[PDB]
Amino acid sequence: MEISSLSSIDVFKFNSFSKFSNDKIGVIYDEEKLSKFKVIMNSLDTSEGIKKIEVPKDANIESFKYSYHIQPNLKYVEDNNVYDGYFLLYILVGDSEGKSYIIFSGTELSYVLDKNNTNILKEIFLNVKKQQ
Amino acid sequence: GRMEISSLSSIDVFKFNSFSKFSNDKIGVIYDEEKLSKFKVIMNSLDTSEGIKKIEVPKDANIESFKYSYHIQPNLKYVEDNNVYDGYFLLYILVGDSEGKSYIIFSGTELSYVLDKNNTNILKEIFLNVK
């Protein structure tokens, strides 16, 4: 299963570490931001700058530049066929050490990302706005 | 991104013998997943990364300036309109000049890209010891 494309990322207020948020902030549609997030998502288990870790249970949102619950809406390839899918993620971008975290909602699967990846995440999540 | 490369099966490598005609002088083939996956990422990021820039085709590039110069045929699968298709590209590639830059030119077109030092380092890994 490989992500071929993202169509959007729905962005929600980070209001829980256990339940995916229904407090919607906005949506990311920009092709370049989506392409950069795809690359990160496809490199979680194969990059020197990303590491699988236990869920940081004592993390809090005030320690990070950006904290959101996000739903990347995507297409993936499996068995030479294309499928529509999504993920429900908690994302914590840019702590005091320049690290970031991605947690898969409803699981204990999580990753820590290095400064290089954090810089990319800061580009992706800059000025998330509601059309209002 | 209406067309997204999902995977590469190989890259055929040919001698860089022209700036106008794709070479049929075969040197070898790259099969390594680590290498192919890195090349895939570059090809999908040509228009969407800070380290790659669309440029006019270089008018006075010399193969002697580069660590590697090849004509390459990446063999691939891509997604378009919810289908997986077989495809390929015919590229001229110039890897690692004295400024650490690399170039990709699409054979038979005016489409070309310059790649930064980070990408050049990746290309050097991909094109090390072609057999």
Task: Give structural notes.
2 copies of one chain form a homodimer. By secondary structure, chain A is of the alpha+beta class. Chain A has one domain (2-132): Immunoglobulin-like, CATH 2.60.40. The first copy, chain A, is built from 2 helices and 8 strands. In chain A, strands 1, 2, 3, 4, 5, 6, 7 and 8 form an 8-stranded antiparallel sheet that branches. In chain A, a hairpin with a 5-residue loop joins strand 7 (100-104) and strand 8 (110-113). In chain A, helix 1 runs antiparallel to helix 2. The longest helix of chain A has 12 residues, at 31-42. Chain A binds chain B through residues 2, 4-5, 31-32, 34-36, 39, 43, 46, 75, 77, 80-82, and chain B through 1, 4, 6-7, 37, 41, 44-45, 47-49, 77, 79, 82-84.
Can I get a quick summary?
The structure is a homodimer. The first copy, chain A, has helices spanning 31-42, 115-124; strands at 2-13, 24-28, 50-53, 66-78, 81-86, 89-93, 100-104, 110-113.
Please give the oligomerization state of what you see.
homodimer
Helix content, binned percent of chain A? 10-25%
The tally of beta strands of chain A, per DSSP, is 8
What is the fold-level CATH name, i.e. the topology of chain A? Immunoglobulin-like
The gross shape of chain A turns out to be globular
Proper CATH architecture of chain A: Sandwich
Output the number of helix runs of chain A: 2
Top CATH class of chain A: Mainly Beta
User: Which pair of chains has the greatest number of interface residues, and how are they split between the two chains?
Assistant: A-B, 16 and 16 residues
PDB class: structural genomics, unknown function
Keywords: orphan, Hot Dog/Thioesterase-like fold, Structural Genomics, Joint Center for Structural Genomics, jcsg, Protein Structure Initiative, PSI-biology, unknown function
Assembly: dimeric
Entry title: Crystal structure of a thioesterase-like protein (CLOSPO_01618) from Clostridium sporogenes ATCC 15579 at 1.70 A resolution
